[PDB]
């Protein structure tokens, strides 16, 4: 029996609808589960408003990591600039029944649920442009020298509408985030959104969030993930289908280079040889973003043909922006300040 009956076998707090905490919070319901615990909808008797409360797992490794999230949340929430409002606001936190509880302003549903409500047709390029611009302003706020925060898990489920009928958004879940200059953990980011430097076991910096953003923005407009790998080897092959073999100056410094590639006598790299007969991937660089976005064929799958807001020129700008965000080299990958000056946003 777990934590005197309050917890299940997965270190989660067994949620009971109606339950009341510290004579203050009235638990309405479970919203969802996640690696780190649960999120519930609750009414705050005192402040007279609905909130969302993230209940962290009762397990030392999860609690300790979640204290980092709180520190970062508070450092971001106290900053004196208007860009801070693209990050969810942590109102407060407390321990209860041996679970750290994080109390948040209430938001609306996530970008994934938005995509699914369109049956994966994708949202319009105009909307995509509004999400991209907010995301890049958020990333600029994270890059503020005093913060230097890497989110480390951007993806649609971590971007929420503030309001179900508007286009304002916020970034949630700094559960896996760190600041620059802090022990390198391989195996970060969700696989579809994971940068090549992380797949390659290399050091990483704030640019890994720009990589993920590029992937997310393509998925929001097409309705489906750009790089849909079932495992790391598949993930790297799908990136390669689109962007080519990564450049030698990267692979030469990459501890995991030989998990995916091999080096030729002349110092060039190729994908690792496979069983003769096996053909699984398009050749390196032949799956063009140009075609995935249908720049000149009516947009993704032709579905935007003859709509306003979706011109060849609009697509070429978007495409150019995506490719600058999916630069293999993290030192030349477009940074937030410069992404914001891009003509996609004129």
Output the smallest distance, CB 137 to ligand 2C3, in A: 19
Q: What does the alpha-carbon distance between residue 237 and residue 260 come to, in Å, rounded to a whole number?
A: 8
Q: Which is nearer to ligand 2C3, 52 or 147 (CB)?
A: 52
CB-closest chain residue to ligand 2C3: 34
Residue 263, annotated ligand binder? no
The distance of closest approach from Cβ of residue 41 to ligand 2C3 in the complex, given in angstroms and rounded to an integer, is 7
Q: Is 36 annotated as a binding residue?
A: yes
Smallest separation (angstroms) from ligand 2C3 to the CB of 51: 8
Contact 110, 159 (CB under 8 A): yes
Cα distances (Å, whole numbers) of residue 151 to 43, 69, 342: 28, 10, 23
299 appears as a binding residue in the annotation: no
The answer to the question of whether 278 is labelled as a binding residue is no
Q: Per the annotation, does 253 bind a ligand?
A: no
Query: Between residues 106 and 271, which has the closer beta carbon with respect to ligand 2C3?
Result: 106
Residue 35 annotated as part of some ligand binding site:
yes
Name every residue whose Cβ is closer than 8 Å to that of residue 177 and which is 6 or more positions away in sequence.
68, 69, 72, 149, 150, 151, 152, 153
CA dist 334 → 176, 187, 189, 323 (Å): 23, 23, 19, 9
Residue 131 burial (C-beta neighbours within 10 Å; 0-12, 13-18, 19+): buried
Binding site for ligand 2C3 (CB under 6 A): 31-34, 36-39, 52, 54, 88, 104, 106-109, 157-158, 164, 172-173
Active-site position among 7, 8, 28, 153: 153
**Residues followed by a gap in the chain, C→N > 2.5 Å:** none
In 3D space, the residue among 344, 289, 340 whose CA is nearest the CA of residue 314 turns out to be 344
Identify which of residues 32 and 309 has a Cβ nearer to ligand 2C3 in the complex.
32
Would the annotation count 31 as a binding residue? yes
| DSSP string over 258-272 | HHHEEE-TTS-EEEP
Nearer to ligand 2C3, 225 or 299 (CB): 225
Report the residue number, 58 or 237, with the smaller CB distance to ligand 2C3.
58
Nearer to ligand 2C3, 26 or 157 (CB): 157
Name beta bridge partners: 251: none
Nearest CA to 183 out of 203, 199, 201 is that of 203
The answer to whether the annotation marks 245 as part of a ligand binding site is: no
CB of 104 to ligand 2C3, least distance (A): 4
Is residue 93 within 8 Å of residue 102, measured between CB atoms? Answer: yes
Residue 300's nearest CA partner among 286, 289, 313 is 289
> Structure tokens of 145?
């020298």
Answer whether 260's CB lies under 8 Å from 233's CB: yes
Q: What's the min distance (Å) between Cβ of 19 and ligand 2C3?
A: 18
3 state SS of 2? coil
Angle at 13 between CA 9 and CA 15, to 5 degrees: 115
Give bridge partners of residue 100 from the DSSP assignment: 95
Q: Does the active-site annotation cover 23?
A: no
Shortest reach from residue 134's CB to ligand 2C3, in Å: 16
Q: Which residues form the catalytic set?
A: 153
Query: Which residues are documented as binding site?
Result: 31-39, 54, 104-107
Query: Which residues are documented as binding site for ATP?
Result: 31-39, 54, 104-107
């Amino acid at each position: 029996v777990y934590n005197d009956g309050y917890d299940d076998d997965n270190y989660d707090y067994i949620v009971k609808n109606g339950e009341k905490w510290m004579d203050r919070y009235e638990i309405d319901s479970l919203i969802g589960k996640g690696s780190f615990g649960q999120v519930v909808k609750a009414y705050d008797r005192v402040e007279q408003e609905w909130v969302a409360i993230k209940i962290i797992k009762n397990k030392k490794a999860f609690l300790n990591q979640a204290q980092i999230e709180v520190r970062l949340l508070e450092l971001m929430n106290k900053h004196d600039t208007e860009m801070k409002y693209y990050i969810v606001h942590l109102k407060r936190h407390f321990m209860f029944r041996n679970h750290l509880c994080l109390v948040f302003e209430m938001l609306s549903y996530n970008l994934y649920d938005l995509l699914r409500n369109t049956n994966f047709r994708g949202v319009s390029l105009n909307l995509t442009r509004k999400f991209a611009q907010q995301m890049c302003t958020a990333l600029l706020f994270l890059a503020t020298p005093e913060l230097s925060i890497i989110h480390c898990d951007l993806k649609p489920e971590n971007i929420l509408l503030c309001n179900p009928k508007r286009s304002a958004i916020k970034i949630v879940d700094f559960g896996s985030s760190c600041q620059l200059g802090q022990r390198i953990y391989q195996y970060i980011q969700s696989r579809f959104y994971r940068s090549p430097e992380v797949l390659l076991g290399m050091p990483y910096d704030l640019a890994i969030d720009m990589w993920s953003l590029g992937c997310i923005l393509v998925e929001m407009h097409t309705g489906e993930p750009l790089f849909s790998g079932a495992n790391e080897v598949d993930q790297m092959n799908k990136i390669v289908e689109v962007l080519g073999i990564p450049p030698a100056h990267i692979l030469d410094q990459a501890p995991k280079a030989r998990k995916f590639f091999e080096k030729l006598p002349d110092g060039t790299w190729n994908l690792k040889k496979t069983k003769d007969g096996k053909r699984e991937y398009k050749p390196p660089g032949t799956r063009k973003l140009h075609n995935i976005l249908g720049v000149e064929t009516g947009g993704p799958g032709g579905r935007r043909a003859g709509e306003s807001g979706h011109t060849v020129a609009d697509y070429l700008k978007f495409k150019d922006l995506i490719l600058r965000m999916l630069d293999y080299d993290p030192k030349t990958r477009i940074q937030p300040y410069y992404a914001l000056q891009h003509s996609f946003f004129k």
